[PDB]
Amino acid sequence: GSSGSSGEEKYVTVQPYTSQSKDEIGFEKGVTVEVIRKNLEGWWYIRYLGKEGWAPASYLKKAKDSGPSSG
């Protein structure tokens, strides 16, 4: 299957978003997303459910992973 779970900056959704068209991707609140591109028009290209679409940065936030990793 996917066997990927790899990216640059993994963000998390704090609110559900309903996509009107394919161009945009709809997700739920409390899931993990992969931020690929970052625009200025509140548009952050992410990847969810094995699909890349346009999502509002407003409904996204940088996740904080806890680990012993030093720097």
UniProtKB/Swiss-Prot annotation:
The subcellular location is: Cytoplasm; Cell projection, Podosome
Query: So which tissues is this one expressed in?
Result: Found in several cancer cell lines, particularly invasive breast carcinomas and melanomas.
What region holds the SH3 domain? 8-65
Disulfide-linked positions:
none
Domain of life of the native organism: Eukaryota
Q: Which family does it belong to?
A: Belongs to the SH3PXD2 family.
Q: What is this protein called in UniProt? A: SH3 and PX domain-containing protein 2A
Q: Which organism is it from?
A: Homo sapiens
Lineage, broadest ranks: Eukaryota, Metazoa, Chordata, Craniata, Vertebrata
Span within the full-length protein is 268 to 325 of 1133
